[PDB]
Symmetry: C3
Subunit: 345 residues, 3 copies
């Protein structure tokens, strides 16, 4: 009861504790907000999952979250936004994905020097983007992280002496796909892996832990994450993706985020909105294939550009349907509360 939703009672009870405890809560909420979850217990569970995946990635992501939150505080950003973790998840992703795409080994402590720096740009970028997107009542989903990490990975590249990144290359030959070597266990495993890849994690246990963290806050978010992962796998099979690429969940995490966002988070959860979420996730999968192919030419990973663009497109979509209701950004908490608010409206 006190653990589900966004833990409003815990927020009230902590708004008068020590500043260190409040900062820890903001960091946990920022960790959870990567998947639109404003829950500190979910953030703790996600931290446990990341520790299961890679403790070094956990260190880099936690440092990114801390630095992003501290920079948002120093820049005088909205304290309500900071307290809900809306200024820590972009830095979390920045740290995690500069650890993931580093050609150096684990515990390359020098990588903390760039991480911090490009975690400091995440609040700035957010602010700048909020100067534009607020004029359309749009969120800045992961555009700060995407901009920052794309710029970092292009600036360093694979041949940097200090911070070399992993080699990303375009596809140059037709894959050999024989449909009799499909492994149903691996295809099923790609659903939790697809969920976990929103944090850059390929461990199936990490993805299952992330699903548990999603369910703790909002069961509808967990359901839409699983459905988005499945939609991503189906799209990958539809355009004849090699099975090895499908198994890694790199075709699903953008669709996971898109299905979470459109299906109940920023639209009111109705069956029309659920169908819109499915269509947005499919279009996001194909746009992710396109963006990955385009950005592999300059040697940069696709990130979550496709999720941001597809979700922005489907939020800017205007229909005369009363059942497709876009909630005001200030009223958006989580799909159950969003549906209740929509019913009252």
């Amino acid at each position: 009861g006190y653990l589900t939703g966004d833990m409003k009672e815990y927020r009230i009870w902590l708004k008068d504790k020590h500043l260190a405890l409040q900062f820890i809560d903001w960091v946990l909420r920022g960790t959870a907000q990567v998947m639109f979850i404003n829950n500190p217990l979910s953030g703790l569970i996600i931290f446990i999952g990341l520790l299961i995946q890679n403790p070094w990635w956990t260190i880099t992501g936690g440092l990114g979250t801390v630095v992003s939150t501290l920079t948002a505080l120093a820049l005088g950003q909205d304290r309500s936004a900071i307290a809900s973790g809306l200024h820590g998840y972009n830095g979390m992703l920045v740290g995690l994905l500069m650890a993931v795409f580093s050609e150096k080994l684990d515990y390359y402590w020098w990588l903390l020097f760039p991480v911090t720096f490009t975690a400091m740009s995440c609040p700035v970028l957010s602010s700048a983007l909020n100067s534009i997107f607020s004029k359309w009542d749009l969120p800045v989903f992961t555009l700060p992280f995407n901009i920052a990490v794309t710029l970092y990975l292009a600036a360093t590249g694979h041949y940097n002496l200090f911070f070399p990144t992993t080699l990303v290359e375009p596809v140059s030959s037709v894959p050999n796909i024989t449909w009799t070597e499909m492994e149903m266990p691996l295809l099923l495993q790609a659903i939790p892996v697809g969920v976990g890849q929103v944090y850059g994690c390929d461990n199936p246990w990490t993805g299952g832990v992330f699903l548990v963290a999603l369910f703790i806050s909002s069961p509808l978010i967990c359901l839409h994450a699983a459905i988005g992962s499945i939609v991503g796998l189906l799209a990958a099979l539809s355009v004849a993706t090699p099975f090895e690429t499908i198994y890694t969940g790199l075709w699903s995490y953008n669709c996971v985020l898109s299905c979470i966002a459109i299906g109940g988070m920023f639209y009111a959860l109705t069956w029309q909105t659920h169908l819109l979420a499915l269509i947005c996730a499919l279009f996001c999968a194909y746009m992710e294939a396109a963006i990955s192919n385009i950005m592999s030419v300059v040697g940069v990973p696709p990130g979550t550009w496709a999720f941001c663009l597809a979700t922005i497109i489907f939020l800017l979509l205007t229909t005369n349907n009363p059942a497709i209701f876009r909630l005001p950004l200030s009223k958006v908490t989580y799909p159950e509360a969003n549906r209740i608010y929509y019913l009252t409206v």
Copy 2:
């Protein structure tokens, strides 16, 4: 008399017929609206020209138009916009150009599965873009088609197993141009071919049929299309393009669209506006060369990005000249009526 303009009398007489006839009219108007023509007879003539070029391309383009119109209806878009074909031409182009840039043979029926899908995204995109561009009173020229087809051709690419696209590669050597092998007949033929390449068609007869379709609705549109084709050829000669590339009309169709749009369609046709149309077409030709070179690196055709960007730039241009008059978007029908409205104003 009843066949010229936008056939307002026919629209009035059909607004009370069967829904199937109205849908056929909307599809024909969407076919014609690729070249800013809101005329069903012009759409029928364009369909005849496409049948002359390639019946398979006709099938794919017609399916794209039908799917785009049906998706716009299902999404509750403005019925006035749907009835004028403003939600069918982007899907028409999507179907036509995914047929054109398919490495498979003609009548590869499986290509209808992707076509439909990315024809369904054309209304959505339009809506999303209209949420922004309406704040500047701008049209969404072919940005839905350009976004959708660029994403599709990047997602599949040349090495896709199911839907391989044609190989697009950057230029890697200096062309050998000897100016004594210029063929004046082929240079002249490149004018109707340049007009026809707005639909992806390289048949000169198809381009002539398209010019007839333009003339049926508005002689000024036909004149500006021919002048834009000539301007594109002159620009191609100006930057020393190989004659083989010039003959294909790939340097002219963007300029055709830009000259139509700026010269009388969205500006009031005056001599100052005609000069502005010429300058916009020239800048569009050079921007098209730039965009084609840039996008060949990722293996994607240039599309009509240059026309959209150049026309948006020249519409956003603000001058103190009273003779350069930008008509309100709701008053834009065709250059003759636009000039009459401007004279009354």
Copy 3:
């Protein structure tokens, strides 16, 4: 006294002289406005520095400035903006950098044909961009020049028969950096060279002359230019750039412009704003590395994209700090006057 600032007394005394003298003043002010200086004496000193660097580049840049100013006059742009040189510096940069990146020899007079043309697009672009950026009270820093020159250099490319550009290629191997061959004299020389590279000039004397021109108008602008150059060099050393690349000042000029803009020009000069300028210059250096690496894939020089993007981001940044004050665009003259205005406010 009459030579510092923006020479308001000279502007008043010249507003009633011959039109040729006024046009010469506008051209000189446009030359100076590349570095945010609205001073004709500074423009003359910059012209002297360019003559020191390369008289052919001086010819191309002067022609670009003249053509841009004349096109702005013909298009009926704001006479106050034209008289302050705000419509001549983009054309100046266009001419200078199409001369710099030309694979032909000096005094290739045919290069004046493209220069003029893409100097005519600089006002248009500015106008178009001002239709958007004015809605956020933002300047169009060098986006007209960046768009125009990127399009030109992509359209022609290295293999053009008439106007071949220099070969720009991505890095394909790890540099061999031995830190014992650092030359302190060359590292120090890279500061004035970094300042001079805003005009594409690598002569250290040209950069020193540019610093003198900056100091004549505003000592704070000169100080921030030097500090931005130093910040660019420090960033280049931070990401292990080969010393040969560092010595050319190609890592500093974007940071020079960013430090000038944020540190006193469009923000009120306080110590908080000076720190913000340092951070913006650092982020601009890294974004410049990223953009250069990305655009070398399509064979295009980075230009000043990074400066424009970083400065726009840091201007759109919203803080609750009263000491970080964004001046209204109409009140922006130069850092000393800006600080006085901020103190009165």
